[PDB]
Write a structure and sequence with these properties.
Layout lengths: L3 E4 L2 E10 L1 H10 L3 E2 L8 H7 L5 E2 L2 E4 L4 E4 L38 E8 L6
Parallel strand pairs: 4-7
Antiparallel strand pairs: 1-2, 2-7, 3-7, 5-6
Protein name: Lectin-related NK cell receptor LY49G1
Subcellular location: Membrane
Organism: Mus musculus
């Protein structure tokens, strides 16, 4: 209906204009958003429930300092972490299949999931 949607306390915007990962991110930031941080399942689950088939860019990648993977946020979320399925051999940055999520080439261009948290109350 729209390319925006709220669930529960967060909202969501999907910029259908495919981009890199780097790309997607700087772009959520431009307008106060942020490359979607997932907090659990209820969010995994129904998130991919309806995505467009086209993959997309979510704020998880390989941080070096950490020399590990990470949320644009630097904070755990409850979500099954299988981080070991992944090689630097494939790619680095994290996308979101309709199926499940893989990594790979931050240069590969998909859509973004920019997310927000709606505290306060829409008026």
């Amino acid at each position: 209906e729209k390319y925006w949607f709220c669930y529960g306390i967060k909202c969501y915007y999907f910029d259908m204009d495919r981009k890199t990962w780097s790309g997607c991110k700087q772009t959520c930031q431009i307008s106060s958003l942020s490359l979607l941080k997932i907090d659990n399942e209820d969010e995994l689950k129904f998130l991919q429930n309806l995505a467009p088939s086209d993959i997309s860019w979510i704020g998880f990648s390989y941080d070096n300092k950490k020399k590990d993977w990470a949320w644009i946020d630097n904070g755990p979320s409850k979500l099954a972490l299988n981080t070991t399925k992944y090689n630097i051999r494939d790619g680095l940055c994290m996308s979101l299949s309709k199926t499940r999520l893989d990594n790979g080439d931050c240069g590969k261009s998909y859509i973004c999931i920019c997310g927000k948290r709606l505290d306060k109350f829409p008026h």
